[PDB]
Amino acid sequence: ESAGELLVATARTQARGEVLEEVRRRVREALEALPQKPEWPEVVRKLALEALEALPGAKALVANPEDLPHLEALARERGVELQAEPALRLGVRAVGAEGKTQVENSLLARLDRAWDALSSKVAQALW
Amino acid sequence: TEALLARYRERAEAEAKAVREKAMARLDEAVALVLKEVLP
Amino acid sequence: IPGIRAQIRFIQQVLEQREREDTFRLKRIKGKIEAREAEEE
Amino acid sequence: PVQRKLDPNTPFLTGMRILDVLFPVAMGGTAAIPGPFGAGKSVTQQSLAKWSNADVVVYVGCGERGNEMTDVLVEFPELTDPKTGGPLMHRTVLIANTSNMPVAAREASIYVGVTIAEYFRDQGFSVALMADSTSRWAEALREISSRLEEMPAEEGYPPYLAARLAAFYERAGKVITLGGEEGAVTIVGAVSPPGGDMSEPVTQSTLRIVGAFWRLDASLAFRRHFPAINWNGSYSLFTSALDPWYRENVAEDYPELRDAISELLQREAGLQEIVQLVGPDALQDAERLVIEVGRIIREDFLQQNAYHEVDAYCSMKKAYGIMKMILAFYKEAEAAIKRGVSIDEILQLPVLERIGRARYVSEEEFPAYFEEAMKEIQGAFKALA
Amino acid sequence: MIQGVIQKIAGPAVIAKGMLGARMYDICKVGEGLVGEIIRLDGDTAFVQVYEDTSGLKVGEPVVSTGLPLAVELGPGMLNGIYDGIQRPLERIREKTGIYITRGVVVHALDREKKWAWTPMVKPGDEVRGGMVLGTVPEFGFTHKILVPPDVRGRVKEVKPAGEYTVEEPVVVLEDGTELKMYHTWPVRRARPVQRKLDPNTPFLTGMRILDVLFPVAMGGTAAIPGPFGAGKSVTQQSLAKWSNADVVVYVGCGERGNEMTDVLVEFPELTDPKTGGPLMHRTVLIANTSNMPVAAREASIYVGVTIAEYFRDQGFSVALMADSTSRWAEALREISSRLEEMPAEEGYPPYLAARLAAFYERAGKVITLGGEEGAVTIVGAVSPPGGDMSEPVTQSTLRIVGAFWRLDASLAFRRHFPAINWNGSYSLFTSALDPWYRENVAEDYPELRDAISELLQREAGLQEIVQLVGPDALQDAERLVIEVGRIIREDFLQQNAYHEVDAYCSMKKAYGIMKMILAFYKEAEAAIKRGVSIDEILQLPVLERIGRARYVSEEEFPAYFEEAMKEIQGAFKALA
Amino acid sequence: KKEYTGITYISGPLLFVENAKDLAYGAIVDIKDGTGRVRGGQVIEVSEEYAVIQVFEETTGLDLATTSVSLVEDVARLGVSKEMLGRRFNGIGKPIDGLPPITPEKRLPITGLPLNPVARRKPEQFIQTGISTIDVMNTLVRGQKLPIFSGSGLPANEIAAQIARQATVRPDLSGEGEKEEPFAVVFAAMGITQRELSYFIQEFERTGALSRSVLFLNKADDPTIERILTPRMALTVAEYLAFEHDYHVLVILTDMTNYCEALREIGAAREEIPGRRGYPGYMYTDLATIYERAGVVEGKKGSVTQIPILSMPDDDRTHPIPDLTGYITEGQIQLSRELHRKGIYPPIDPLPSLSRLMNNGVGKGKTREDHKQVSDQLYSAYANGVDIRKLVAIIGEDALTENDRRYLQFADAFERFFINQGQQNRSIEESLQIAWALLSMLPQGELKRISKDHIGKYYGQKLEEIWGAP
Amino acid sequence: NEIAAQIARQATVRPDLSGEGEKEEPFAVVFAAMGITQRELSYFIQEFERTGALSRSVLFLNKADDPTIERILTPRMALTVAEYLAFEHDYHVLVILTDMTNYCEALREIGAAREEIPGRRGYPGYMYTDLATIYERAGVVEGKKGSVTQIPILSMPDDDRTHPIPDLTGYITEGQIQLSRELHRKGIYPPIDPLPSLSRLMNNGVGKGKTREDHKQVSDQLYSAYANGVDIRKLVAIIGEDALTENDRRYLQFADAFERFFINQGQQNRSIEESLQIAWALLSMLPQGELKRISKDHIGKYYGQKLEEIWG
Ligand SMILES: Nc1ncnc2c1ncn2[C@@H]1O[C@H](COP(=O)(O)OP(=O)(O)O)[C@@H](O)[C@H]1O
Ligand SMILES: [Mg+2]
């Protein structure tokens, strides 16, 4: 006789999950549409410098072929090797000096790492 | 006495529709907040 | 009753002795593997 | 992979009275048969392979004698499949790895057998998988770990033995296949603890996973009383879920008869404690009657001759009739005891011979034999009084 | 100050490099700083056993060695307080952190903010030795004496005038530059020195007739009791704490379960000191550890408690120390030993369990303090083996060094007999040494009365087979008389109500009077039986009511009641004839 | 996203990675292989040379040239919320009910901090479990740790589910008369099979008890570290609810024997010397840390109650697991194989069962004033009847007195009606009424353990109670 | 050793019962000794000289004063010779191993010298496989007339059936013949204890066309009656003997007569017919109603014969 309340709760939970999924999809679209914006070179500059400073010393720096024109200047400034790799997208990868350690700063990884934390904030703000 | 669940089913459907229509009106603000927070 | 008690204590002593021997063998193998991995340099 | 796991509702008919009645195992469940050497594990597994109602039977000879494999190979082709009537070997897949074969191949044999069973389940059949001994698998793992120079957990076994056993046993179950059909795998594995010690870690690890447990007894084997299953040390967790099937397909009051038999056995076991203390003659008439009924149940119902042309297979209805006869005789005997009749007079009543010989009656003559025996039982007490 | 960095983390064991010169058993701060203990030295490497959880630590974090072993702070402010296994006040921890004990918290055992009324007793230019008295501080009605540390010698250069000061104030400065405060530190694993240890020739009055008479314990002796459930051990311990000779009571929990410790913590503050109107907690120190607290605290709580007791008796008082469950401490010791991969001796216990138990129990005794005054420590440690088996190694090791054993029994409590000490299993070894004191201070015939009572109880216990087979009414006159005398003894002398206003405490004189009355009545009854009087007539005499109400008579009004009852005992038999 | 690729050694559950000193001890990491599959692990040992990681799953397909290890979290933590009620989890916080993942209000370390002894208070009130044998003779008190000692084939799961879906609080009996305090149930399952999982899911769904329950379910084929982590996560959720939202929480642990076996396997995998009977030497401390998280706190209206369940290996009470469990907890409930074989459910044996906190949970302001006397009289009478039933076998019925026959009939009726309640949900008043009806079979003067007032007020009722609920 | 020598001396097939033709092929004995003493070796040599079996016997002798490591290779060489003979020249081989305990001792010594992880009581973990590689070399091969029969001998330490050596041997072999010390102390020879003994391949050579048709039922009835007598012995040891029912007295007397006549046979050779006749005479001590494991036809054909009529 009280199962209708449970079904209502499940429906509300499914609606909340659908709303969160829609927000995720919109944020994903906004992130993947970034390389068409004038702020994109500055974002990749920030990613490159953050990756290079996270490792105390980087033997080489890996960048996307479309990203290297906007980061070659500080690639030469920092004195690290530049190497091209088609597979990388929306970020740069820095390889440690010893070659055993590598750091990745793609925007997809950042979104994956931060969405689980900002889910509570966006749920509080939206409703 | 076997048709009690239909009214609860339709009430749950109405609640879900109300929740989604309420949430649709504020998606852009949340998306902007997420973009502001993620981007350094 | 006393015979059963004596049998019980005898069995307990035997089991405890076997457990102690197994523990000593485990410590021996740990010590010898440590010695090998240390002297291999 | 499978679509979904289903709840077990149909029983796995092994053809043995004690296993089919007292400790049933459902289609898609698991069972274990531990015991010392010479207790009758291999003969029991061969009996299940010959007489079970599974579509396909997969037999894994993990680290046991080769003569068993030779016996199976020689004898199975001359037998007939109970379902289709063709040769029995046409439904059997045999994986053999004898004692003198390489040690590392036992794990491979177990995995190959269970994978073949899973594939035949995926085809939509009902597969029964029987492993000859997982103790040899544990010993092979111990030998491999010793060669690896690992740290043993207990009695030399590697730490992951319990995890491997659980992974092997969790493959069984009744499923909805990826093609939309329905199939099931039933796994029955024998355990051979060293020295018959049931506290050995393999037996304890198995005991916490299987849904049915069939413990063997050395004393019963010494008396040549087979199948020599320790009633006190066994159990089954599928009894409650299989009750509707028993009601629908066997008889309406089958669970009540099974419960009555179990209660009588429990009372006899309880009275045995006083019997071994003060002797059988120190009891009253009712206690002596209970002891005699327990003896009759043990010798005429639980017992089964695996080498007999008729007693080897016993359907559910035959066992139901036998237990109904035993219960009716017990009721009449206790009623007569309330009337002052001496216990010694009851024990010489000729219907006991009929009850004892009812086990050897063929599956065709049983329907009339049961009626005649019930009428004789009623006459021996009601008409006499 | 030796400093190093973390080299290697594996469970609770931390390896630190660059720690050359670190002493063997110093306490270390590991991490940002968790408390640890050095257990091994190897080159520049030291092995540290961290007390608390090490999750979250990283290689390269600082390691600082304090340079001192585990020690307690001895000084004013310990009474009326509750401490954990390593002397951390729980009240201030709760105030700082809330309901949980967050790791890495640091507090001081003695409050540094409270002000005490200093009162010097020394003058400039006076030579001072270890253990001498420097001053006086009032504390809840006690005269707390500031003592020189045992290993300090010199002469006084200056002394501060009387006033208000904190424990950190250097009240006395020696001519060598040494500054003496109101407190000092002492390692918990070293016994405090004494001038001389005296012989056990004085009794420890418990206030319970059975323990004070049948199984006495000497002042400074050791006793052990079982802890079976339902036997009323807690009320017995509370009565002992309330009515003992000790001026100061020290209670150690050492790893008991949570709810029992909660009951102990909520029961003592509601107890009242019999000698005044205030609560008993003003002369009690509580050490509490639950079974989920760090194992090192549970292992060191016993030593902390015994060291505090040693300090308090060094001040010149009598101290009663109660270890709640030495079995839990033995379990903690076994766990610590297993952490070191030591070879177990018997049933998993380390081979040095007996040595540790002896080292703990031998700190008890009555000694002449370094100040020349008398003090003592009495230890009553309870053992509660799992299953109640007395063959368990901890019980065997304990019974070989204790001087008394008071076997609590659940069967006696089941039939509503209290304080439920089984007289068949209990025994004591202090009777011979205490006999002269009994003759001097109680009566010249006290040992004879005690032996007569014990013999009567033994004879009553010897007949239990026949009275159980055929019943009491089938016996002869002498057997029935013995049974009834034993029943009267059990119901009027051994039994005692702890909650009763006047029956809670019994002096030696009242017990002696009751024993003499019982023996006289037994003699008169046997004489009447010899004169042909029926047993039923004897069992209906009115003086039995006077005997039964004896234990409920006030202490000061007892002698008149005793004289009247003694006169009535001889009157009732001779006059009736 | 930090990535370490200096792996130099793989064997069994352990793998070594080089130049990874940034990994904190006890952290959670995930291993990614060439095929892209991601499997998790925990850091066991870290030093300047290399770090040691124990893999959750099997290490098939790993290689030293293509795999990589990345950090997930410094310390194992769980995200809790007040909306976790009605959800199912796999034991590491992953939902398995198909609903969207919860939004965590806050994240808490699963290895919770010990309670301050001076902050606890004395347990005072009881829990109505709906079972007469537990409610009357072995009363459960809010804040007690009362384990259930089961066997091999005994129906422990059925009793656990029945208690979970029947337990409730009784504020009216204490005088409050309002359901102000919410009630919640936390269910933890360790090393269960598929059949047990399906049974638990069906039982919780079919009666509506899921709306107030949180389930942490760990299968038998799941990684053992998940089995280790399940009780800690369950207790973290329970403590959060009780001490931050004034909930009354009942925690049920399905099988502590599986937990002990998993702990032994984990200890052996890290090359540690076992203690007694091959079990780890720190088993007592681990079990104490699990059990001691329950209790009641001064200044808080919430409470936590635990009912651990364990199967004795060989029906031995001297085995280390039940021995330590009884050495830590405050009693036990003993299941009897004889009663189960005689068709009695639930097969709880009153004679060896015990509750050490019952005297606090009963009285005049709670339950009823005659609770304790009725309980002890029932215990004594049942013991006497059971003892007489053994002698009647040899000496016959006619050689007994009238009192012996009355005791025998009382014991038989007690076993038939009191213990064998089936699936009924008996309140405390109904159980007391049944007990008084059973006691009315004995003579008036035979009730030596009860005061005359209660006897005069309640004696004389006939047996017409169990027939009111077939 | 006496039982082994008697078996080697008296062993023979019965082709007439099986109708296989009177081939009458003598057995070839391959004898392998491991750490045997001088007394036992001299006894075996004297017995083989007396029976004239040395003309068709291969001996591999490893005396107790020989090095302990040589015991590793002796059984393998003996079984290699036996296999070669049987499967290349159609011989019938009876292999006797003097003592497997010495072989296990040598194996444990080698394992401890190499620091293997032990099993129970220090024995190496691969002892099961090592013993299987020796025991499982016997049998009959399809398409060949040869045969290899193995009769290992081992002494249980302290008469412990749970010791690793006898336990693994039972787990590998096809049964065992267990001797009882109590029977030996009562003067019964051979002291073969029937209850713990077992023959796994017993039913493959008994039936209608093989030996006699009543073999299996008589064996089962004998086992049941002996077990009943053994239980009644404990009952008599517990309570007074005068309280026994007549059935209990009958079972007790049957057990005593069984021990004194069927088991204790001395150094004489019994044909299968004589053994069956003695078994039926012993079973005749019980009423016909108690023979529940024997069909009525065999009872009618054989029951009733007197024990004293066999010899007098
Ligand atoms: N059900 C049975 N009916 C008749 N004889 C049996 C039965 N079970 C076992 N036996 C006998 O007991 C022997 C036991 O050997 P086996 O079954 O191979 O034991 P295990 O599997 O323990 O090695 C069988 O060879 C057979 O002679
Ligand atoms: Mg077999």
Residue numbers in the entry:
A (entry chain J): 61 to 187
B (entry chain I): 81 to 120
C (entry chain G): 169 to 209
D (entry chain A): 194 to 578
E (entry chain B): 1 to 32, 34 to 578
F (entry chain D): 5 to 474
G (entry chain F): 161 to 472
Question: Can you list sentences taken from the study reporting this PDB entry?
Answer:
To determine the ATP-waiting structure of V/A-ATPase, we prepared a cryo-grid with a reaction mixture containing 4 µM enzyme, 50 µM ATP, and the ATP regeneration system, pre-incubated for 300 s. Hereafter we refer to the structure as V2nuc. We also obtained the V2nuc structure in which ATP and product(s) are bound to ABsemi and ABclosed, respectively, but ABopen is empty. The V2nuc is therefore assumed to be the structure of the protein awaiting ATP binding to ABopen. State2 of V2nuc returns to state1 via state3 of V2nuc by the same process.
V/A-ATPase is a motor protein that shares a common rotary catalytic mechanism with FoF1 ATP synthase. Here, we report the atomic models of 18 catalytic intermediates of the V1 domain of V/A-ATPase under different reaction conditions, determined by single particle cryo-EM.
